[PDB]
Nucleic acid binder design. Sequence first.
RNA 1: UUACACGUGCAAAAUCUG
Length: 612
Amino acid sequence: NSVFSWNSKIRGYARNGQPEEALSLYSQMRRSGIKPDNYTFPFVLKACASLSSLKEGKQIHGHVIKSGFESDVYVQSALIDMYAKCGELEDARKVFDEMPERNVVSWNAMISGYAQNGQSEEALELFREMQQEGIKPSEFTFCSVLSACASLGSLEMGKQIHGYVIKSGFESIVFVGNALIDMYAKCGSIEDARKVFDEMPERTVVSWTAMISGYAQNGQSEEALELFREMQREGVKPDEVTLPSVLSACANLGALEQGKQIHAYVIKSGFESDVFVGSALIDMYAKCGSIEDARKVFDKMPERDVVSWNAMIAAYAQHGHGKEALQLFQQMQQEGVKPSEVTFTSILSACSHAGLVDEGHHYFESMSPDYGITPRVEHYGCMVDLLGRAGRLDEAEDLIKSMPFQPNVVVWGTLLGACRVHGDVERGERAAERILELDPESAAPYVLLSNIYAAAGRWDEAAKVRKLMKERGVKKEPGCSWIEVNNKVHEFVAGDKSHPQTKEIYAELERLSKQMKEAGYVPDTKFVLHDVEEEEKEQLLCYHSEKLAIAFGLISTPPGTPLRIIKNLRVCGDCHTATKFISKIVGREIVVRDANRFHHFKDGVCSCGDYW
RNA sequence: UUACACGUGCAAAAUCUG
Ligand SMILES: [Zn+2]
Ligand SMILES: [Zn+2]
């Protein structure tokens, strides 16, 4: 044929997404005796960068040398991109440094090469050199350096780039705007991200995903879910990257139903084999009270990274299956998956909630010797949690002081919560004091100390701690348990008499306590922390938040149906005993969550073995 | 005049009285 005919065929396949066809035609063209020129090399090199075929890229680079195209800006810039997309920033920089003449694209190719290979600062440094040479940026430049800002978190740098974008007339480019959304979220300004998102003239799925990820990562899970529904309302179809962030919001909200819907979408749309989708699925099921479904997703997973293992390890940890979490960590090492810091936080949390004191000390002490993992403040908080639940409050406080980190509200709150369980009034005062200096607005140290005093019979003291809370304007979030029945969650506080079906819920509670009394249940009043006679103390135990949520569940669901209840507070001992009696009385498996840990009541016992 | 583009999931604690 001709060089034009060969170039047009190669050009078509290189930009269409058929890099091997472009390279096969390159070989046939060379065998044919047709000499490729500067209109062949950029598209053939583009195909190499697409396939990351470094060996062929150097082969074509050799052809460029022999053909005498070393001074061509198009050929050299394609060489920069090829080496950069092949993970060879050194050779990409050597091409860039030796170009006798470059343009914006050659600068963009090198800057994108740095930013795309975990090299965000050398990208910004080259971008700053670009101003000193008076090179006008393009939409590609601003899109690439905004991705570097997002990775580094420099908001003031990105604020300057956003301004430069507007002054350069690129604010309506969908790529540039998508970068601004991701940058602003990753830099801590979710509001500036929403402003760019709202003012956008055109929004792809990347636009909706970057906004939703920014919300779910920032705690606003109700809003990421609302934008997911609004995205479907506008006819935008989520890809395989949208659902992981969406499922992470379902896990935070206990939206077991919602998360089930996404799983059906995942099956229908062929995303079932994606690691991110699988890791988000096991995390969703676990945080929603279904360790069984979480294990099923982990089993069927065709491929697993360290996050998929860490998610299932944290799944067992949160559900009190400490031993099972430790078997998984061993198969991780046998299957050649190195443990991260997130791995050790999860297995240490598993040992804490399951009482594996010996094993918890082993993995913690062996975390840095036998593994490159160095201790974060989260691993020490796990140890304070482990010792606190084992009753070793002296070792817990001594670890807090000797900690190579500055103590926080979590690590002292762990000790304070443990003092509540074991009745250490003195240590409770000390722990509550250190929390108030760290944060004076947290209502937890007040109610905790008020509960500690009231448990000790120090009513006058407890009244003053409650008095001091009301005068400092400290507001506490109501302890409540909710239960999803027919896609409608149902919130219940202790002694709640505001529910529509209150009289049938309470009559059910009366019928239940009748059977519980015959089964041998005797409520103790030492667990009631109110200075009230015995007649109302047993009545107060009867109407706790989860006891209302159970009573509503078994009057609105068929008999024998498993019930799930999510609370924001730890269950007391007598209510843990009462739910054990209820589990066999009603013939159901009742899954109740504390602040984080899950209980499983079945056939008259709980999976925690009365250790939580 | 070719070449250069953006979005990912897994981290320890506490509120039974709002
Ligand atoms: Zn209770
Ligand atoms: Zn239990």
